Symmetry: C7
Subunit: 74 residues, 7 copies
């Protein structure tokens, strides 16, 4: 299901489906996962940005730098 040595496959298993991205310092994105690399840089389509639990705006496409990521959940 998730190769015990490849945690990032969890992202692969979720391509083109809705995911939750928790960022550092209270930000969060919810959108369709379209792409990602080993650094966890990733692209979401039709994404909503949330700050402190509230929606700030919706972005057609967004590239998130992996270094700002805390966790990802399908």
């Amino acid at each position: 299901r998730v190769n015990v040595q490849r945690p990032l496959d969890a992202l692969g298993n979720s391509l083109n489906s809705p995911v939750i991205i928790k960022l550092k310092g209270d930000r969060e994105f919810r959108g369709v996962l379209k792409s990602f690399d080993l650094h966890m840089n990733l692209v979401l389509n039709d994404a909503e940005e949330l700050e402190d639990g509230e929606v700030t705006r919706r972005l057609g496409t967004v590239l998130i730098r992996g270094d700002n990521i805390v966790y990802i959940s399908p």
Copy 2:
């Protein structure tokens, strides 16, 4: 655990419940399903805690190793 391989502690916890303490004093409890040398890891049936209070439940979650303070089997 080889005195030169701290990560072996992780391998010895695969499929077993663990507590992940993140920076910013955030906490996660769940079943360790995967991990790499950077300590990125996947938990199943996970729960996010805040002051001993579950604030979120996730069936599966990928945690970046850079934000981890400690992992307790």
Copy 3:
């Protein structure tokens, strides 16, 4: 549209197109993407630094250091 393993093709796809940049510390920039590298260092032309939706400064061209970027939205 973007290769599932190359999140950066989203930037390649946006060369010479308007983009929004969100930096750590909440600073925000808008401009025409002209260049970028794997570190996400990038150059914008006709850039505008924003705050509360207000343009607090304009720069004909600016080089932004990638390590300060949270996200980029084409």
Copy 4:
């Protein structure tokens, strides 16, 4: 202790009680079982302290090196 390798101080503390001080004013105590060059390390019968008082017991724990301020063998 080789003046060319301070980590030897860790090697000399293997299986002995140590004190770990993390950034953010967090502190741990327990038996050192393993560690690497990054200073990631495992403690057994570990305890987390706050003002000298023991807040919680974690048993086995893997601590990431990047969060360490100092280690008192």
Copy 5:
């Protein structure tokens, strides 16, 4: 004026010309760019530090470490 893959070449375009350096913590420096490396470490001559639009210090020659930089503009 810069290769789409070489954003740092924007620095080369400013050599011996005045530039504006914005650092973390909302600090700004202006001076003539004299040198720079791949880390964005750079040296300014006749440098001045600004705040609210006014020079708060005159530093003359100064070496600025790249990891503190947010952006650079001609």
Copy 6:
């Protein structure tokens, strides 16, 4: 062309280690590497000048160091 020598010339001597967050340590330099990770003996931690705690031996990670004064 090698500042790390300054430390070498201080081996077995009392030094002052100033860390980030305004924390300060004083002890006898016993060992150190290129990353500036170092070991102090009879180390003393202090705040506002007053010693807060004592450590017979401590390993300090270089990445937390602001400066070292012999």
Copy 7:
């Protein structure tokens, strides 16, 4: 200074007074004696400042490069 060698600025400042601005806004002033590519450096007769006023006097101090904002000869 060579347009490709920013470090020459330090070379040209050896045995000369310099101002070191550190992250956390601390300020140090003293005579530059040595430095490496990582910008670690040694100052003689260093003085620490705060809001423009001295705080401490040091005879010799080694400053780690990673904490530096800028160095002004």
